[PDB]
Ligand SMILES: CC(C)(COP(=O)(O)OP(=O)(O)OC[C@H]1O[C@@H](n2cnc3c(N)ncnc32)[C@H](O)[C@@H]1OP(=O)(O)O)[C@H](O)C(=O)NCCC(=O)NCCS
């Protein structure tokens with residue numbers, strides 16, 4: 001009996017690999033760090049999706065296809081508002097997306113499809129966020145980037161060069177991350193020759209859960225409690241004496257430091273001095289990591305992604321509610337990618353179980 | 364590497380057990396045959412759900428709770444029609460159900476909930492079927508049974524004592540059937556402390572697939588090709604000579620005959636002479652099973668459930684399109700049951716995978 005299937009390797013894939021020991025994470029042959037830092041979400045997507053970075057012309061077309069599928073169909077826009085006020089932006093995303101499922105979505109999923117999804121997700125998220133907040137809806141525009149457009153349809157403004165570059169590098173890191181609950185959920189779902197939508201819809205439903213992609217509220221508060229760098233040590237020092245734990249650090253699967261968390265701290269340095277909510281984090285990190293050395297010497301505890309995900313959001317006034325969604329919109333790539341591959345060489349996840357209950361006699 | 368996880372037992376459960384070798388299938392301690400044959404869907408549901416048959420008063424209340432949650436909320440009825448004509452009754456069921464997800468549906472799923480779902484599913488299915496068929500909508504009625512109400516909201520009439528008893532015994536057999544694609548899908552989905560709806564929505568999406576609960580069209584035609592018992596042997600005999608295979612027989616997991624298929628043929632005999640579409644099947648079976656003995660002696664090939672599922676439908680003018688749905692509405696019990704249990708003692712399905720692709724050097 002393999003409870004929760006830990007250590008059970010039920011899949012073969014050339015999309016991504018995560019290596020706890022060696023501190024590394026690879027996307028289709030390249031390092032995540034490199035993609036997060038020196039590329040654009042779109043390039044990234046295109047990689048996880050197809051297998052290589054895109055040519056100078058190769059890309060421009062991909063964008064077009066995207067930019068075009070951002071518009072919310074007439075009835076969809078309408079539906080989002082049909083949906084009553086008691087529905088997480090999540091409970092919704094899940095619903096709405098499902099609403100996209102038609103005849104067009106048959107067994108063999110199609111890039112055409114994987115694309116629509118990836119591209120439209122943020123729009124749903126936003127139009128919905130706006131509506132609930134009684135703000136007037138903001139239509140996407142073939143004019144901005146992808147990660148940048150996501151901001152625009154949410155706020156109405158164009159983000160700081162820093163606020164942007166950061167988020168982007170973030171989403172990219174959230175794009176794909178091996179086999180995890182949801183990603184596995186979709187595969188499983190497509191396992192019965194089902195549709196891309198039904199798979200994403202599944203995965204989505206699975207993301208809603210709090211154990212996967214939940215806001216780092218625990219961290220967000222940490223930061224919110226010390227707006228200035230001065231109080232840096234003070235705070236840490238206090239709760240580090242009666243043994244309380246420092247929220248954004250240490251990891252279950254990363255024995256060495258987290259590459260994602262790493263690729264983030266780095267981009268931050270690049271755009272330092274342009275965003276107080278960010279440059280603060282930088283400090284808090286560096287000042288906290290050197291205090292762990294002190295109070296808990298030996299135990300290699302390194303800053304974990306969750307930490308910076310908390311920071312980047314803090315910088316862009318993305319309250320906790322918009323976390324998971326935003327995350328989803330990104331892992332959306334990972335999913336499709338995984339779906340598209342599951343379908344390449346299918347399977348039938350039929351696992352079995354042990355029956356507890358007593359059995360009746362044939363008599 | 365365990366591809367598709369065959370032989371992998373990742374779950375413990377006291378809901379159901381399927382035993383290929385010995386020709387038996389057990390629901391919470393009782394035999395399916397017995398439940399299918401001598402009980403009412405509601406009793407059945409109540410069993411898979413709670414663990415025992417219901418008391419004389421114990422039941423009546425369950426019904427009430429059901430009968431009450433059959434009504435389609437104001438906006439839901441409306442939504443079903445919002446949904447464009449290009450959407451399988453399935454693509455819809457999946458959507459709509461998801462539409463039910465609110466705040467009420469949090470981590471620990473609740474019977475209150477498992478119930479609403481089970482009870483409302485058919486209604487969705489129907490109201491939708493009607494609308495597409497340009498028929499006027501038919502409101503459910505606290506007056507008929509459950510399986511019987513499903514017919515009513517679909518047709519507008521009250522089914523033959525035979526047409527009824529049959530279908531009911533059918534759905535009951537479709538209720539739960541161990542760990543299978545979807546049922547597993549829901550568990551997986553709830554694995555991250557998600558909601559009942561998101562789980563069912565997942566499972567649903569997984570059912571849509573053609574490899575799970577697809578119509579036995581292959582069989583349905585067999586029957587449709589010989590309206591009268593006379594042509595019985597004739598037909599069979601022909602395609603059985605150049606080695607063509609007889610669609611409703613033999614099974615992958617049932618070495619001995621299928622109990623479901625069995626529990627069905629039986630109920631049929633009980634209500635013989637009252638339904639030509641049914642009494643025909645009876646014959647075709649018996650006349651075909653005795654021809655297999657003849658052409659392929661030795662190989663214990665026994666009639667398989669799929670066969671009768673094809674027949675019962677044929678009798679009630681339930682074209683192939685309504686198959687999966689109808690099936691879903693039933694397995695809906697199995698699901699909830701399984702969800703409700705997954706949550707009792709959760710887990711985290713984190714399985715892992717083998718990366719094909721080449722890795723880059725640290726450099
Ligand atoms: C995930 C976990 C616990 C790391 O797993 P592991 O270190 O491999 O397994 P552990 O039980 O933690 O190892 C025990 C040790 O961790 C140390 N440790 C880890 N994080 C610590 C922290 N923030 N503060 C103090 N000690 C910490 C303990 O001091 C202990 O070392 P000693 O017994 O020698 O003193 C991580 O340290 C953590 O708690 N992170 C905060 C939760 C989080 O990531 N939240 C994000 C969403 S809110």
Ligand SMILES: CC(C)(COP(=O)(O)OP(=O)(O)OC[C@H]1O[C@@H](n2cnc3c(N)ncnc32)[C@H](O)[C@@H]1OP(=O)(O)O)[C@H](O)C(=O)NCCC(=O)NCCS
Nearest residue numbers: 579580581582607608609610612613614615659662664669
């Ligand atoms: C599912 C399957 C193939 C049974 O699995 P198994 O019998 O365990 O594995 P098999 O490959 O079939 O065993 C091979 C044998 O099956 C026999 N067989 C099974 N069903 C047969 C049929 N309908 N007609 C003729 N032979 C059949 C073959 O004759 C062969 O025996 P021999 O080589 O000695 O002649 C089943 O027989 C079948 O084909 N059913 C029809 C498909 C179905 O169930 N459809 C429902 C949805 S449309």
